[PDB]
Design a protein around this ligand. Structure first.
Ligand code: NAP
Ligand code: NAP
Ligand code: NAP
Ligand code: NAP
Ligand code: FQW
Ligand code: FQW
Ligand code: FQW
Ligand code: FQW
Lengths: 251, 250, 250, 251
């Protein structure tokens, strides 16, 4: 039988490209989404046209709350339900906006979204994934290459990403005896936010030493595919920058 | 007029040592505490016997909740109420216990406490400190072993990682205000009251420099360095006080 | 036409596995070696029996000296002489042995060998490589345990640390020329011939993932990924291949 | 009676400021120097005017060669000849200039100067220091906050400073049983070349979060003083950035 993978925030952009490649590689996928129902479904439609009954969707808010644990257990159950197994978890879903330290959402809501999506939900999905277990089990967390050169006023986001590094390493250590590997892919700039101004996107583009451009989503997905593959079987607790050298560049 | 410091979890152990040392250097101090009220007031008494009207206590749960932001603001407000200023904030309070990934409290509670004390409360207290504004600085009690995590401590460890993020993020954003943010990262220091001597000795034996844990004073010494005029250009630095522990391989 | 790679210290162990895999992937290979002459020609025989005119050997001492820059230029010149091009450089050769800080090679020789092989030759090889210039990249064999040094291996460790800086500096400088520079950082892979069986086991039992060292093939897999088209945006990255070993506190 | 320190490259700029403050703290000093005899001597004169017979000067090229280990043994020995003891070693001397990868010093000379001064001499000085011990003994190495965001075309310099981090950690571990601590100070930008145009100096100053300026040599010296003091007695293997947050600033 073919392995199955969960990819969070998989309706669009990097998470979409990750789902697609895992699928092209032979996985069945659970495409998780929060708000993008329509996009999640048309992706599943497209993958199930290629290969019948190989893609399902799964809706969940990953904001931290009293139900998040249940929600995350249900994401992992959906995969077990659809496909009878869960081999791979990609923690890609992420909320992202500025939370300036010095003066909309209340601060406690910002904590819940930024820390819940970037770190608490990953921890709870990891728990549920491991609890439910020639197989090749792994987890890939979508990290941040620039996490030690944080953006101005993005302190909660940055806290969540740093937490996610902690989880990556802690979970690699603790789940090694189960044969579950835990790694990370850390983009620098890849697809820039649809919202982001065009001059603002070019500013970032021009700082990238390898080609003065952003990574494609597919280039990010390549690292993921490597990490879940049989050729990464001794690798756990490793976070691979896919940043074109951006992190190396001084102010 | 004397500067003022807030030290969280200051009723005993390392936080008491940081407040004692801050007091000896001439700070007025707020001794924040959660459950250890007797130890808190007993300390504020010793300190006020030494110079009167220079220590107050302040009780607060720093578990994450929707009122944690108010609570952290009230902590900063307590320092201005007592002393008319707030120059230093030391984030020392921390919950710690195992949270195994494969299986007491609910997990929602473990999240709230481990992440809230180690990370969210430090962020809120930082916002509050900065919003209320010399030599202004913040010092976070980090973990020298943060990149070699203890088995089954993932939520604690996530919290100490996030506290690194904050140290770095806040140092960048608060620089324009002349507010420095740095950290102090013990290895093993005072071991927990729960721990038996045999398990303490197991950790002691791992330390290259002397095969013993840091004294609480030794941690406080580095905090005192970082708040001083001698570290005026230092911000975003996290100083290990670990006697070489983090350098030792498995 | 087929791309070509130079692999240093490729006659045995990890470097051999890398040469083999690069060769299986479609590459022509320069097999560099120092002393291991028989195993080197033996490997090119195998390779060339599989695909004629796709491997050549190239002998060089990579100890630091005033002629190293010439020896390194010759290694790259040899790749061009044999194959008309040089797409990939792998810096794998390395000397390793204790150099205690406190009391039959002289210390000037220990410096030249350990820093030579592990750092200066890589630098010189990278200069010569870039000077002669498609998916062009370089891979350095680094050490996952580098921030957790082995006792009395300061010179070796210094070499590996330097190789980190080289990886990163060269990534930065060569990016405009389309040349990527990355690392693979084993923990414990095939353990030395001369290592006792008790001390091998001792390292094996430390590894979380599977309680065993990596196979050379496992290391090579990560090299293969980094030179491949699935890594076209990766530069300046160092990928640990250590089964979690570096995550384990003392 | 009074403890003794060796400071390499102590005739000007940072090393001088370090030697002055150690002296002000009550150390006797060996002022090592390469070409700057006149500043070295003039400092030793200023210092011996404060306290008779508490400063000596000691010339040596710290370029890697066959003689470098003797020279480094000689620098240590001279502190013992002058003061009867050697309590503190500061590795401050450093060559610094571009060594581009692609196109009158030859490259073997560049290697010898940049690697010798920034790494190899520090190592040899450490072993001579330790050999002679076998009281608060420690070693402070002058590192670089920016070592992971290197300046373009300084690979040999950068490689030396990276090697110097490894030595700081390696020596800390190996010499801990002798009660010798080994730590670093890692400036970001400090005293800038007086020759450099102010306009160019300002581009660097403007990047520094804290104060938009470079560190004084005295500010670097303060961290060195902390690290050799009785208030750092459990500290070893640590590298204190003194950088005004410069290393936290993305491109
Ligand atoms: N783009 C980059 O340059 C970049 C750089 C560094 C790191 N990364 C990391 O790489 C990953 C992918 O980046 P990206 O730009 O593709 O992500 P993105 O478009 O910002 O977000 C991806 C998905 O996250 C989901 N999400 C947001 N809040 C959520 C919530 N509360 N609950 C559940 N899902 C939620 C959204 O799903 P719905 O649309 O279904 O609501 C969204 O489509 C992220 O983890 C990001 O931090 C990206
Ligand atoms: N000790 C070590 O070896 C070690 C090692 C690495 C890092 N560190 C760090 O150094 C710092 C000091 O360590 P320590 O051993 O002195 O700490 P500790 O004794 O475990 O805790 C310090 C205080 O934190 C407070 N705290 C706990 N839960 C709280 C909550 N929900 N709300 C508010 N406050 C709460 C407690 O207050 P009450 O007593 O008033 O209830 C406690 O006295 C910590 O941040 C620690 O993580 C210590
Ligand atoms: N094995 C591990 O557990 C491990 C762990 C961490 C990092 N690594 C790194 O992985 C790489 C490969 O490791 P390995 O165990 O396969 O290496 P190894 O067998 O110890 O050394 C590889 C080759 O380097 C060459 N070499 C040694 N001194 C030389 C000199 N002066 N000039 C030129 N070549 C010289 C030798 O060539 P001849 O036989 O031709 O003389 C040797 O065969 C090395 O960079 C190593 O540092 C290995
Ligand atoms: N300045 C900064 O912004 C900065 C930034 C990062 C790190 N650092 C580090 O901080 C330390 C002090 O910096 P600095 O700017 O004060 O250094 P500097 O002025 O560039 O150099 C200090 C001294 O090093 C000595 N030196 C150079 N080559 C030598 C050789 N071959 N043999 C023996 N001695 C030699 C020189 O002695 P003579 O004058 O006697 O010839 C020179 O005065 C250095 O280690 C540096 O890398 C500085
Ligand atoms: N979920 C999510 N996470 C993101 N992280 C980043 C990022 C973070 C730090 C530096 C650069 C890019 C980005 C790219 C956009 C960006 C650009 C500049 C600063 C912060 C973020 C991103 C995103 O679009 N979605
Ligand atoms: N709030 C608080 N935090 C602590 N962190 C540590 C610690 C953590 C990781 C490695 C070494 C010591 C300690 C020392 C005890 C300890 C040891 C191992 C895991 C968790 C805690 C500690 C503590 O007593 N209180
Ligand atoms: N050229 C080369 N480099 C090596 N590095 C290591 C290594 C280094 C640090 C920790 C563990 C293994 C090893 C594994 C054997 C070893 C173990 C401990 C110290 C130095 C070497 C190794 C090797 O066999 N050849
Ligand atoms: N021996 C020695 N080592 C040095 N390292 C640095 C440095 C290196 C990397 C980033 C910033 C400054 C410097 C200062 C280099 C510099 C000079 C002018 C503007 C910005 C940086 C330095 C030096 O002057 N002497």
């Amino acid at each position: 039988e073919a392995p199955a993978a969960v990819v969070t925030g998989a309706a669009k952009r990097i998470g979409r490209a990750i789902a697609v490649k895992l699928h092209q590689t032979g996985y069945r996928v659970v495409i998780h989404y929060h708000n993008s129902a329509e996009a999640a479904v048309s992706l599943a439609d497209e993958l199930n046209k290629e290969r019948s009954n190989t893609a399902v969707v799964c809706q969940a808010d990953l904001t931290n709350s009293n139900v998040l644990p249940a929600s995350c257990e249900e994401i992992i159950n959906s995969c077990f339900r659809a496909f009878g197994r869960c081999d791979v978890l990609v923690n890609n879903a992420s909320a992202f906006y500025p939370t300036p330290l010095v003066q909309g959402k209340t601060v406690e809501t910002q904590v819940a979204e930024l820390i819940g999506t970037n770190a608490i939900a990953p921890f709870l999905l990891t728990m549920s994934f491991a609890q439910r277990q020639s197989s090749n089990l792994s987890i890939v967390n979508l990290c941040d290459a620039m996490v030690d050169q944080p953006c101005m006023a993005f302190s909660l986001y940055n806290m969540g990403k740093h937490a996610l590094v902690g989880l990556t390493q802690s979970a690699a250590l603790e789940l090694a005896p189960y044969g579950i590997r835990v790694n990370g892919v850390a983009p620098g700039v890849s697809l820039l936010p649809v919202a982001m101004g065009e001059e603002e996107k070019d500013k970032w583009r021009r700082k990238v030493p390898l080609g003065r451009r952003e990574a494609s989503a597919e280039q990010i997905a390549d690292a993921v595919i490597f990490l879940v593959s049989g050729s990464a079987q001794y690798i756990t607790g490793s976070i691979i920058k896919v940043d074109g050298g951006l992190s190396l560049v001084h102010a």
